[PDB]
Every structure is written in structure tokens, then in C-alpha cells.
Amino acid sequence: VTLCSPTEDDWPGMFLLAAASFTDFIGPESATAWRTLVPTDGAVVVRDGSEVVGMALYMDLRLTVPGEVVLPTAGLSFVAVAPTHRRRGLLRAMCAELHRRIADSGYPVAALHASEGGIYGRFGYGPATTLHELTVDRRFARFHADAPGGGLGGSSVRLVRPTEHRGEFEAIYERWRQQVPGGLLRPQVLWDELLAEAKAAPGGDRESFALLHPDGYALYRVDRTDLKLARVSELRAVTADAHCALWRALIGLDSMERISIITHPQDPLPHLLTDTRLARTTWRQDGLWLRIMNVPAALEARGYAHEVGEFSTVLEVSDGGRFALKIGDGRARCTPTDAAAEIEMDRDVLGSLYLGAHRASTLAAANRLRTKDSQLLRRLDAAFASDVPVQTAFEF
Amino acid sequence: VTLCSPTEDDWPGMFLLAAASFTDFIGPESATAWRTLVPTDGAVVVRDGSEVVGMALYMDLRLTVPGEVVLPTAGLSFVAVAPTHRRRGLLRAMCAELHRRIADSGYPVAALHASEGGIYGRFGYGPATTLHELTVDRRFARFHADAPGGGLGGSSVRLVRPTEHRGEFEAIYERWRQQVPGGLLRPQVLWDELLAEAKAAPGGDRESFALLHPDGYALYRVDRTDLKLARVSELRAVTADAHCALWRALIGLDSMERISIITHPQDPLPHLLTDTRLARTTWRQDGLWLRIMNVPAALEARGYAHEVGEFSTVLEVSDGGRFALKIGDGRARCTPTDAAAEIEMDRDVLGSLYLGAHRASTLAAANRLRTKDSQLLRRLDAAFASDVPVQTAFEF
Amino acid sequence: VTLCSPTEDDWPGMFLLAAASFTDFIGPESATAWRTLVPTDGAVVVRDGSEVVGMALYMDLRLTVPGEVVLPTAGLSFVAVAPTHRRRGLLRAMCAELHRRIADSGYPVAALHASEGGIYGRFGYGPATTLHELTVDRRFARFHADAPGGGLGGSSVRLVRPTEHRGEFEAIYERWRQQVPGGLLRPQVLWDELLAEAKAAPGGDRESFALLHPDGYALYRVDRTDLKLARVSELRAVTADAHCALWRALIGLDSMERISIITHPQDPLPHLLTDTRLARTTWRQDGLWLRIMNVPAALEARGYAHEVGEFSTVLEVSDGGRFALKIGDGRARCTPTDAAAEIEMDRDVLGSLYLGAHRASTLAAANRLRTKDSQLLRRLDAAFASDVPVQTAFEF
Amino acid sequence: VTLCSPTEDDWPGMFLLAAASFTDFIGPESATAWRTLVPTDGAVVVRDGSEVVGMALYMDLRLTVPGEVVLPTAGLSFVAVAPTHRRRGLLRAMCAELHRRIADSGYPVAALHASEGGIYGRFGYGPATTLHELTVDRRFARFHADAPGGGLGGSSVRLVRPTEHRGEFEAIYERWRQQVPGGLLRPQVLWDELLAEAKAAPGGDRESFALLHPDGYALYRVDRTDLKLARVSELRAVTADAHCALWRALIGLDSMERISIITHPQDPLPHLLTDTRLARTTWRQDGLWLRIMNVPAALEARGYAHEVGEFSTVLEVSDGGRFALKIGDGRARCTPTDAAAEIEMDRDVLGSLYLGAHRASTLAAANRLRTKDSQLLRRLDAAFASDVPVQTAFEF
């Protein structure tokens, strides 16, 4: 059991293990498109003294954090141990090697989407975004008098084939991702893959349509088996006008009973309707997980709430360093210190605070985050909050 | 169709309409217990020129708001129009009379639980608390090393018959309600009713048991039909130690597959487990609705986040007044002004901000709340936040 | 295996066999109420050379047929063979004895409700009424502008406890039953039983309520398990105004999603709504079965459509006689003849024609009814039609 | 928002709107086959000042009405408003233009199949045929001794590939459609489309088979997911012998549990079985909707029951004219008059009477049809009845 970077000859073995580990696997032709996002030493395989029994890699990503600040981000992905090689510390060995490489390459954070919710905490990954599914029973939905864009004259929203308005979608998404914490740069090859899955497959998914606003779009398709359900795969709006306009159009799908979307806890949609209850939360789950690789770099890089006044504390991350943390005018200075710690937490907890989706108060109540001063707890809660709500870009 | 206060002779007609309007109706014997909470002119009936075709009333309640401040609260309840008398403006007439009386009596707020989510917005009621159902698959649940009270020696939690530890339950709840926004004083007659429903009914609910900590308790029962599901009817914990200890005991119900609880969005339970995903959100809904009766009284009465610095604005409530609002050192002065408004909202929106469960940002995005300054929006978000998360006491 | 009339000592054995044969069995106390409707030689038992292994009986009923004509009707009921004594010709022996007795007593027809739909055809019983279940999704239901009783002023319909308006229910039902083919006289002891089942049972059915119009009523209850479904057990309306008024009240049960009713194919309810499709047919089944005991007596007793002009034919019933049938001015003369038959059918088929629920055309297409003249077929179709649609009174 | 006849350049925009409005849409290649049935000014589009946001059209159809009389019929179809352009009166504008054109072209009736049951009443369309789904549990089904074609010697019914017996299917259907009210001429291009859908699709429907009698056929296929269910897509029989023979063959599909068919209320199948209950009604819905364009032309064109004697009345259609209606010897003369009206109804109601599927009595009970003489009501019921039961040809 040797741990190496793959050679050209290893990739057939890697695509076999992928096909057997992931039910959603998109085949080797399209794996080669995502493979353009893997840098030269971004991948490790385990061979059995010989076929591939383990693999892991990272993609080069750009993640927007609070303050509209963009971080080079190592996107962990394609992680699989053969079912013949479980309980052998293969994941621990592969994750340790990729973390060494990601850290030495100068990435301040790593990120992933978890197959199960109990694997990645022990490697310093913390859930950092929250997925909300809203199912609207659109037959009862009426917009509130206060809702934008419900007047006379022509609608600003168009029904279009996605594949004929690539540039407009790209330009809107680019604006959205630079502006929203959790935003990822979507490279050309992922726009290739998104629009390939927009077309109907024989005995697969149905044709995807788009609703296009100057400042927003929604891609949607009728569900395979439930023909009265429309699944919004993606809705990016840069302005409230665009969000409302697009949802007026979705509520206008008169042959559907229900519209479903994976969105975020702070989606305003419920407040657009006379009956907020018509936007039911059907499903909730962790989205993006963050491992903070360099604590001072990550803490210094993001913006903090201007509302909370200047304050200083000593943060200890477990086997991750101790820092004099000073926050004021929405910036942080984070410096080495050996002063007594006032707040302690494992690396994963910091991940979960970092994009503003979890409150330090909530993690303190669970004793994931220890302090004896509850004034500092209120101050952390306020400081680490994002004025713009954290959202989830795309799964990788 | 006359609108009067009921006389002794009207109450049979009112209990008939109740039996036909509410499936959960607990019968006349026990309606007489809740009736002790209705003050002398707290009820209106509509007679048909004659039987009761409409009724509404309010109970005298005490509601904890941010800053551990307790408000006299008119609890709207027992609202019903006969199915023979729909679309007759009977609800509008009854709600208008009770609002006159509640306002003239000197109640700063009114509150209710909604049968549907689209009735009460137009009367100035806004959803002010959020119910989260968590279903734990307790077979996979392991507590995190960081979780409190997982050491050697005896457990501090006891399994008990609820009916033999009334005083301890009362004393813990009393501590909980004074300390948590959304807290209600539970009077003796509701403790009578809670413990009556704790016993097994023939072809009804199963025996309720209690888990009792010095600083917390949980009442739970196995579900009627799903014999592998335990339903936590109520869990009140004053300290994190008590919350964790009680959940260790619930995860210890080894004959159950699943533990379900109606709790709040900031419940730390997920963070107590190695796999946060094991506490799935099965259900979300509006809890307590608030109508702010007197805007200056309510705004002045509650505490504000000490983190945000002093600031002034002009708030207009639609057909509800305009005020110079000044917030600093966690207090507010709210005075009459005719200065140009900087922030406008309907009365219901203020209800939804008032306990901290909804962010002004989120309601602005839906245009339920209008301003042109986004600095003020951030400042409102921060000011109206509760350091202690808002919870839901009991349905009425 | 002897076939006798029961003695007082046989009735315990009969109530045991009833308890084991019928899941709906209402116990011996209430069996004694129905037993008042059994005449002195109306019952047969089979003993095993000794316990009761077979029973059958008939109740004295009054059945309204087309022309508002009321027939003494032998209501077959309480038919059961022990599971230990199947495939022994016990049903054939019991049915043959009761038919002898019913015929010699001077009953023109016998009637029953069938447990299965393939037992009773071979004994000359034909399905004579049709049960339609309509489920209304009442959340979408709006009454058509043309619908009666949708103006200003007070509703003529009252919500009441059934048990306090017995006389009004009795008087309306009495008007309904005299006026509608399929109508049965409901004796005092069945009004006793109907109102006993109107009250809530522990771990049984919920409280029944009534909607009372001067010319109509509806008894309804929320379903045991589906708390958003209201089950109309019975709706008797003498005038269209009453039918519409009562359905406006049912659509007004705002806490229900769905209203369900067992009614008849010609129920006007769909035509009262802007969307006829909202009254979905969830279920259809045979109601009352008729065996014509005396062909000339039954054919002469009922009224015929005045529209079709005078005509004569020769009807043969298989092992039931041949008759010169002459119909004109809505009356029939039916006399013995040996003239060549023009129309042949088994006794059961005549049962199915007799109340107007099945068309001779439809039974001819299946060759249940043979003729060579299709002019006569059109003439039978028209003659045997009821101007008032055939309905189902109550199960026995 | 301009309302024009489409040009060649509009049809891509129309096929896009079709793909997004109809889940069953059969793609542009096959839309071009149906397009042969659209006459030169049979289509209208709405452009947004520019893409297609609305469309409607009519196909040239031939509809058999009572008396085996065939009417030129404008078949409304391909009606869609963009979800971006709802609540804009676009359907009202398009329906008004097509009605002008259909009326000026000299069509006596228009017809459609409704997506929802509450859209088309207000445009004068009334439900005119009824769809019954029968599901037979064929494991219990035995044919009655009276059923045709159950003797010795060879079966007259053959199992065949549909695609090899096109001419026989065409010739039987042509006989069926000329003979049955609701019958439509099926043109060559719809026979092309029917047989294309007869073949197995990858991850779609299974191979269709045919049962072929000299005077009848059935096309059937096993259901995609329920492999014990056979779905009869279509069964056309000209003689009772053919109907019975074909159903003996269907009951002979020994590897199926259940046979399902969309048929009509008067299908004799139940009466072919010893247990009529084995043919359960699983589903009921409106089929063909009729708008009577010219009242005197339509009323004069169809045959009336010869049974009812000559009579005269004055019919008023709401904003549709008043007529002296005289019916005798199965013909009607319908002439302009200003004499006082004896019977009033909206245009849609006449639609529903016209093919005999709804009784004037039933529509009177709902007050959709007003008269003060109930003798005339009985006379209308009888006159407008079809001796041959009304059936549904094919959806368009």
C-alpha cells in the first residue's frame, strides 16, 4: 500500500473506483473536463503493492468570503476508498498528504461537499453553508401588495432555451459570485457541463428551460416522475427586483402544483407571499465545509461587521496555534502570542464560524467553543456575521 | 348580526362552534380551566338576529421579550366563524372590536398562533417565532468529545412519572420563561391541563414520562402508531449542561429508532453529535405571531444589542404613526415626529422584527420594509437581534 | 344439518356467528333494536345435527319506486354461513326457504346490500342503485354565479348537535323517502341507532355535527385519522335550494381540505361549482339489489315515463313466466300469455331495470337481455327511466 | 402586445412555448404532422412588442353527433400563455379572435380537451363527454353464461403487431366514428403518430400489441413500472360480439393482475362478468368540451329521440339569441322569436346537453338551466338523449 501522485496509467483505475463509489458519476469523457481544474500535484492514489484502491484530489477554486474578498481555495473532491480496503487508515493517509500539499502550496482554506456528515469533522472541516429546500404550492401563492414588479406594462423576464443565452447566464453568475459569501468562480468547462445536462436524456431528465432577467436567471425542469413538480436547479439574482420577477414567472407555471428549490435560510421568497407558510421547508443539510489551513491568513483576509466596536481577545485553535485577535473598523489583525487563551475551539469550528452561517453563541452552548466571558461571545457573534447572507454556489 | 360580549347563556353555543371549528378541542370541562385566563370583557360573540355564528377572545398572558423584559400580552384565541357565515366580514368585525378593547385596556402587544399562515397579516400580526422539528436517528448518534457531562460517576438525570414532580417542573419552567424571549408565564390551570394529558388515554396517546435534571426536564411519549418514534412534547433547560444531559438520556432510549422535537432554529443539539446531519430538520413553521398595539411602548420596553453604537432614524408604521427612533446602550427612545421617514413598514413587519427571529435585511429584500440607506438596515439587523435565541413557549 | 326458524335459545349462537362474519357488527344490545324489524317467521338457522352454522332473515321495509309508489319489501340481511361449513349449499338452502316465505307472505320484491358483487345474481337479485363517492377539494371550490342562495342577508342553514333536532331530521327524511326511488321508511329504532353513532366513541369515531335547513340536512364528522377530511354520512334535501345551501355550508368548513360523500350518479354538486372537476369521483359500487318476487305485481305497481307513447311487447323472465306487457300514460298492464316472446332476460336483470339505474340498451349490449327489435329496446330504455334520479337510502 | 396570425419565423418560438407549457409535448418533427390539420388562418400568436408569449389555434375536425350526423368542428388546441405573461387577458384576447374566425368560417361548433376544468366554461365551452376508467382484477373475472362468443371452435380474435394491420384498424375505426356520437375522423397523419407510439422507446413505454376482430380491435401495453397492469390505450368495437370477444382475449392476459381502460359510463363490460364489481371505476373526468357557435344550426343538425312526441318551447341562450324550438319525429326546427322565454341557459350548458351525456334535469337542479315547467324539463331530457351512448374519440 504505497501513496503516490497518479501517472497517466492510473486514471482508468481511478475512473473505475469513481464509477463504483459515486452513483452520480458522469462518465470518463466528462471527468476529463473537471480534470482541467486539478493542478499538477493535486491528486494522490493508493495502489495495492497493481490496481487503485484509494484516491483523493483538490481542484483550484476561488471562494468569496464576507467583505466580497476572494480566496484561493483547495476544493477537496473525488475522495474514494475501495470497499475491499475499508478500516485501513487510507482516507487518513490520503487526507494528510493532500493537506501537507495544499498548505505548502499557500492555500489559506480548503473546502468540500460531504457524502456523509460525520467523516470530515475530525480532519478540521466544519459545515460553513446551509442548504434549505423550499417547496411552494404555487396554486395558493399570491404576491403581497409590497412585492416588487407587479404593475402594468410588459414583464422584464423571458422564457428561453438555456443553450442560446450562455453569455448572459455567465455574466449574471460572475456578478452574483463576486458579491455573495460562498460564491465560487465557475470556469468555462463547468458551463460546458451545466448546459449539457440542460437537454433531455432518453429515459433520464426532461428538457431544462430558463427564465432570464437583465439581473438574474432561473434554470428549471419538470421532475422525471412527479409531472406536477418543477425543480429549480439554480436561481442567481443580483437585485431584489430580479429575485421577485423570476419568482412571479415560476409561480406562473400554471401546469405545475409545486415549485422546489435548494436555497439558503435567509431566502426572502416566503416574505414575497401573502401566506409565508406556502414556502414550506421540505429539507435542510450542510452545504460547503471549510478547513482553515492558515488561521492568521484566513482571519485577516475576510471583512467583519462594522457595527461592533474595536475589541481584542486570545483565540486558541486546538493543535492549530494561539493568536492575539484584534477586530475593529471591519478588519482583523491576528498575531502569534503565548498570552493565556480567552476562547478555545477545534479547527473545524472556526470553519463553521468563518462564512457567518453559524453563531459562536450556538457553538458555545454545545461546548464546541469554550470561553468564560459571554460579552466576548456576543462580540464574536456580531463580528463574524455577514451583512450579505451566505449562500451555496455549486456542488463539487 | 349583532356583536356583543357573551352572557352565561352564550357559552353552550360557543363550545358547540368550538367543537365544530377545532379538531383538537379538549371538551367543555377543560375549556372552563382555560376560561379563567379570559378577563371580564375579553370575549365577543356574533349571534344571528338566536345561535352563536362567530366568537373571538383574548387571554391575559405575560411574554418575555429581549432584555428579559416581561410584557402584558393579549393572547388572541378561540377565534371561529360558523361555516354557514363565511365571507361576511365577521372575523374583520370581531378582530376590530377586540383590538379596540386590547388597546384601550393598555396592552402594548397582542399575540396568537395561526390556523393558516395567510389570515392574520392583514390585521397587523407578523410571525415572530420559528418552530423547527428535529428528528434524531438515535441508533447512529454519538456525542462529540467536546459535549458536556459525558464522564464517569452517576448521571444527574432521573426518569420519573411527570405527575409526582410538578413543583420541580414548574420551578424550572418559571426560570426558563423569565430568561428566554417568547417565554410565557404558564398559570396553575395550564399545569393542571399539561399533567392530565401526561396519562395514557384508551385508544388515545400513550403514558408520558419525564427526564428530570436540577436545571432542566423533558416530557416525552412513544407515538400512537410509530412505536419506534419518541415525541418530546417539551424540553426546558436553563443551562447547557442540562440540555446535553437530557439529550444523552433521550439518545439512551435504546428501544426507539427516532426522537422528534419541536424546537427553534438555534437549538445546539446538532453540534452535540459527531454527525450534525443526524438531527434532520423534518418541519418548519411560524410559531407565535405578534401585533404591536402601541409602537413607542413596545420599542421602548425591549432591550437592544449593546454591540451596535448609538444611532437615530425616523420609522413610519403604515396607519400606525411616525417616530424618531434613537437606540444606544441597548435602550430605545421612540418619540412622535413629522420629520421625513427613513424606514417604512406595515405593523405586521414590526411584529416579525420585534423578538429577533427575522432580520430587517431579509424583510427589505422582499420590500416588506423600505429604506434607501443600507447602513441603517445593517444597524437595525444588529440592534433588534437577541443575544439569547427566541423560542416558542406553548400554543394557545 | 336441519333448516328451522330460530327459537329464543338460538339467538346467542346467531349473535356469535354475526360477530365472526361481520366486522361492522354493532353488538347484541343494538342487534335487538334491528330485531324489532324482523317479522315472526322472517328468520331461518341451520344447526349442526348443536350450534348455529348458518342463518338468514328478512326485515319488513317500505321501498319507494318510480311514480312515488311505495312497495312492501322483504329486506334480506344477517346472512352468514360458518367458515367451518362453506361449499355445503347452506346459502342456497336458506335463500330458497326465505324466498318461499317472502313470496307466500305477498311481498312483490326483495332487496339486499351485497358483501361481494358475485354471490346474489344467481338467486335473481340485480344491482338496482349505484353509489358514487364525490371528494371535493373545498380549498379551490367557488360556486357558479347561477348557483342558488348566494346573496346578501342571513344564511338559512344552522350548525347544530344532531341529538337536539331529531324531529326535524325525521320530518325531512320522511319527505325525502316518499319522493325518491330507492327511498326506505326509516323506523324509530334506526333513528335511535343513527343518533347513538352521532356521539364520539373512545378511540372510535369523532363527534358528528349537523347542518339543518328547513328542507334538508347533512350529518358529517371529521375522519378518525385524516383530520383534513370531512365525511358526510348522510345528506337529505327535498329542494335544490336546500341541496345548494347545505353544500355552501360544507365548502365553508375552512379547517378541512376535502369533503367526501356517498351520493348517486346524478348528484348536481359538480354543476354548482365553476370547476366541475373539483367534485372527483373517488369510488363507485352497487347499492341496493332487487329480486322481483312477482313480475306482474312489480311491473304494474311502478310508474313509467309519460314521454314514450303506448306500446305492447311479450316479456319472458327465465323460469319466472311470460307476459303481454302493455305500457301507456305512464301505467303498465302485465298479463299471462303464451304468445312468442319478443324480449327475454333472467329475473336479476329485471331487478336492475326496475328503479331506472340501468338502461335496457346497456344490458342488451352484454346479452343479459335478448330481443331482435332495437325499436322496442329504445322504448324500454325510455319507459323504465325515472324522471327523479334513483338514490340509495341506508344500508341494511 | 400585438395579436397576429403566425408567419414561418414564429413557429420556433411557438414550439419553445409548447415544450414549456405541455409535459406531453411530442417534439417539433411530430408537431409538423398535426400542423397539417391547422387551416391557413387557424392560429394566433401574441408577441411582446420580439418572442411569442401567447398562442392558440384550431384544427379542422369532423364530429359525429346524435343521428349519425357529422359536423365540421373547430378543434381548439395548442393554447398557451407564457408564465411571464399570466393575468394579462391574453387567453381572453386569443379565444375572442379564434371564435370570431371560427364563426365567420361557418363552423357550427368548436371543441377542446381542457388542461384544468375551470378555464373554458366562461368562453361558452361545456363538458359534453365523460371518461370512465375501469380497472378489471382479471384473476377473479369469469364471463356470465349470457355473454356472447364463449363456445367451442376457434377464437375470431388474433394477437398481432399493430404496425402490420394499419388498414384493418383504419377501416374499423372509420365504421366506429361514423356510428358513435363523439366520433372524430382520424386523418392519415394521426394514424402515423398512433403507430409510432406503438413501438417500445428506450426508458419510455413498452411495445404495444393489438387484439384484432373483423368488427373491432384493442391496442394495449404493459405499464412502465407496474408490470402486472395492462393499459388498453384504445378499444373500438362496431358490434357487441366484437366487444365481448376482445374482452375475453384481454381477461386471457394471464401474466397480468389488472386491465385498465378509459371508456364511457355506459360500457357494458361490467354486465359481461358474473361479478359486475370486478370492473371498478378508478377515475372519472370531463372528455370533449363543446362550444355551440351557431345555436339554430347545431340544434337543427342533430337527431332527437323518436320516443318523445312533438312539442314546442322558447329557448334563450345568454348573449346567444332566443329561439322558438319545435321537436318532433326526431328532427328540430329552431327559428328566431321574441316570444317570452320558457327555458334559459348559458351557451356552455347547451354544449353539455348537445351530445346527450348530461340530463337537462341535472343541470336544472344546479340552476345552470332555468324553466318554471318541469313537464318541459322531462321532454328536454328525453329529446336530447342519444339511443347510442356518447363516447370520446381521441384527445387533441
Ligand SMILES: C[C@@H]1C=Cc2c(sc3nc(SCCCN4CCCCC4)nc(N)c23)C1
Ligand atoms: C479528476 C476529476 C476530479 C473531480 C471530478 C471528476 S468528475 C466530477 N464530477 C463532479 S459532479 C458531483 C458533485 C457532487 N458531489 C457528489 C458526491 C458528494 C459530494 C458532491 N464533481 C467533481 N468534483 C468531479 C474527475
Ligand SMILES: C[C@@H]1C=Cc2c(sc3nc(SCCCN4CCCCC4)nc(N)c23)C1
Ligand atoms: C374560553 C376558553 C378560551 C381559550 C381556550 C378554550 S379551550 C382551549 N384550548 C386550547 S389548546 C390548543 C391550542 C392550539 N391551538 C389550536 C389551533 C391553532 C392555534 C393553536 N387553547 C385555548 N386558547 C383554549 C376556552
Ligand SMILES: C[C@@H]1C=Cc2c(sc3nc(SCCCN4CCCCC4)nc(N)c23)C1
Ligand atoms: C336480528 C337483526 C337482523 C338484522 C340486523 C341485526 S344487527 C344489524 N346491523 C346492521 S348495520 C350494517 C349494514 C351493512 N351491511 C354490512 C355488510 C354488508 C351489507 C350491509 N344491519 C342489519 N340489517 C342488522 C340483527
Ligand SMILES: C[C@@H]1C=Cc2c(sc3nc(SCCCN4CCCCC4)nc(N)c23)C1
Ligand atoms: C401546430 C400543431 C397544432 C396542434 C398540436 C401540435 S402537437 C400536438 N400534440 C397533440 S397530443 C396531446 C393531446 C392532449 N392534450 C394534452 C393537454 C390537455 C389537452 C389534451 N395534440 C395536438 N392538438 C397537437 C402542433
